[PDB]
């Protein structure tokens, strides 16, 4: 059937997004009366793969002080998503304005065309691109304006599959493997992190969500993990028999945020508490009762979404 080549090409066109030619400004309503302007523009960070990221600058506080960096990795189960998608663009406008930080929102290669670890390799290229900009006075060319950026205050915020990406970066940075001074990642925020495993948890065997189901999560892993791999692969299960030696590596402080009704609740809770009992690991586990996957971005202007942005801000303030 040729209708199969088309549904494949549909996935590519669906998450291809667009690239802005010039810088643009949007209005974002803060926690409909209080507004805020956020400057943003697209830049290429990997020329061979034609991968772009979006930089966000809150205009009001950028001229007041040096901004910390928030690298945001969007979700999509390693198969969907783009930094230009309005759902993710709106969340980054909220991230920049509420956290008073420069937001870096990069695209990354998607499965099944680019199976894992293609997404993790792209994430490291993002941080390496950030390092290249930091040491070369490149922030001054980021906009038609000066930009003061505190590269000693970098934070990685990962949504769903981006939360998995954030964990892989935290491991690679904490193991002394990659090292990008003066870029210093002080903390990691894992928001409903897309972790997997062959054996099911109780919440994974529970009722389906508004969008997520256990069958959909299985199809995500199967289409994104390499051919012939199981859900116990280290790229899916952080505690699989491949790279579970997290006791040795020095992990940065972490924040795990999930909804109480999430299918991925038990995996993230087990992930956080296995880390809390490892020595030298500061991990805060926060569970929002009766919420499903992506409540912080699926329902903005709701109380739960605003509390998440506050918790991330407090988490950033304490770490610096």
Numbering used by the authors: 8 to 38, 41 to 329
Task: Please give sentences taken from the publication describing this entry.
Arabidopsis thaliana (At) carboxylesterase 15 (CXE15) and carboxylesterase 20 (CXE20) have been shown to deplete strigolactones (SLs) that coordinate various growth and developmental processes and function as signaling molecules in the rhizosphere. The N-terminal regions of CXE15 and CXE20 exhibit distinct secondary structures, with CXE15 characterized by an alpha helix and CXE20 by an alpha/beta fold. These structural differences play pivotal roles in regulating variable SL hydrolysis rates.
The cap domain of CXE15 includes the NT α-helix (α1, we termed NTH) which is highly conserved among all CXE15 variants, while the catalytic domain adopts a common α/β hydrolase fold with a central nine-stranded β-sheet surrounded by ten α-helices and shares significant homology with rest of the members of CXEs. E271 is situated in the loop between α8 and β8 while H302 is in the loop between β9 and α10. Comparing the Ser-His-Asp/Glu catalytic triad sequence of all 20 CXEs revealed that in CXE15 aspartic acid is replaced by glutamic acid, making it the only CXE enzyme that is similar to the carboxylesterases in the animal kingdom. Although CXE15ΔNTH exhibited some hydrolytic activity, its catalytic efficiency was drastically reduced to one-quarter of that of CXE15 due to the absence of the NTH.
